[PDB]
Design a protein around this ligand. Sequence first.
Ligand SMILES: CC(=O)N[C@H]1[C@@H](OP(=O)(O)OP(=O)(O)OC[C@H]2O[C@@H](n3ccc(=O)[nH]c3=O)[C@H](O)[C@@H]2O)O[C@H](CO)[C@H](O)[C@@H]1O
Length: 370
Amino acid sequence: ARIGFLSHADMSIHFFRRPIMQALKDMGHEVFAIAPKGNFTDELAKSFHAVTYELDKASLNPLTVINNSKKLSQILGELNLDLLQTGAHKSNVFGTFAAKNAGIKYVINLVEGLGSFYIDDDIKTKAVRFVMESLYKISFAKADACVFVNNSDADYMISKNLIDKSKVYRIKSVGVDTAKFDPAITQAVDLGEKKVILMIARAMWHKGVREFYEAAEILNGYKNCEFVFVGEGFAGNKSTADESFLKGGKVRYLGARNDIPQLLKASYLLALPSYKEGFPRTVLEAMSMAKAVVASDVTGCNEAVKDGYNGLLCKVKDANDLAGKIKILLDDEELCARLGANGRSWVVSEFDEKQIAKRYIEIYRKFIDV
Ligand SMILES: CC(=O)N[C@H]1[C@@H](OP(=O)(O)OP(=O)(O)OC[C@H]2O[C@@H](n3ccc(=O)[nH]c3=O)[C@H](O)[C@@H]2O)O[C@H](CO)[C@H](O)[C@@H]1O
C-alpha cells in the first residue's frame, strides 16, 4: 500500500501515470510521485507524495549515471515502498537497479516507445542500443513484470530475448480521460475562421517538426487552412527546434498550452508526423475529441491510427506525403468528419483511462495486497 511511480520527467507522471495513481489513492494507498522538479511538481505534491531527485536525463557518462543511481537508491529507500512502477528507459533500467539495491521487493516496468536509439542508425547509436538491450536483460530479470503500451515494442523485446513472455503485459495505450476530452462540454479556442491543422508535441526533430513546417509551406493556406503548433522548443539543443525556427515558418506557434481539449475542439485535424512512438497520447486526445488524425506510418502511430478508419497514414520523413494526406482531408470534409467519429467511438470503447488504470492495479494485485 506504499506504491511509487518513478520517472525521469514529471510530465509522464502528470499526464500518463496519473489515473493509476488517483485510483490507488482513492483506494486508501500512499502513492508517491518520484521525478525531478518540474512544472507539475507543486500541484502533484498536493495530490500525491511528491519526491524529487537530481537526474542528468540525457547523459550517458558512466560515473554520472552511477552517482545518479546511488543517490536515487537512497531516495527510494527512504520511502519504504512496497512496489515501484517505473516507466521509460532510464527509470526502467537504472531505476530498477537502484530500487533493488534499496530493498524494494516488487518492481514493475513500463515501455512506452523505444525512442531515439531506434531511430538513429549510426555506429555510435548501434552500440548504445546494444548496451541498453544488454542492461535490459538484467533489469527485466530483476523486475517482476513489464507493461507495454503497444504491441510492436513488446513483440520486439520478446524477439530479442530481453524478457520472458510470462512477464509481458499488454495494456494498449495509457488511456485518456474521455469525459474531460468530450466535444459536447468543451468550448473551442478562437483561432480565427480557418481550418486548423494542429500538431501537439515537444518540438523534437524526431517528432517530425521539420516535416510539419515544410508541409505548411507546401500547402500555403490551401482551402483556408492554417498550420498551428503546440509545444515547447529549446535553445542550443541539436535534438529540438528552437523558438526562432518554430516562429519563422507558415505555422502559428502557440508554445506550451494547458487547454488541449479546447485547442482540439478548434481544430480540423491533428497531425503527428513522428519518426517513432509508443501509443501517441495526442492521437488519443484527438480521437476523444472526434478529430481525424494524419500520422506517419511508424511504430505506435500505426497502431493508434488505422488508415481509412480514424485517420490517414503518411510516409515518414516526407513533407510532400504529409501535405498530400492533409490535402485529401481538406478536399473531403465528409471523409474527415467520418474518420474523427470513428476515432471517438474507438477511444470510448477501448482507451478510456479509468478501465486502463484498473488493469494496472490488477497486475499490482498479483504481488501486493491492494
Ligand atoms: C515514444 C514517444 O516518442 N512518445 C511516447 C511517450 O509520450 P511523449 O513524451 O511523446 O508524449 P505525447 O506527445 O504522446 O503526449 C504529450 C502529452 O502532453 C500534453 N501536452 C503537450 C504539449 C503541451 O503544450 N501541452 C500539453 O498538455 C499532450 O496533450 C499529451 O497529453 O509516451 C506516450 C504515453 O504512453 C506515448 O506512448 C508516446 O508515443
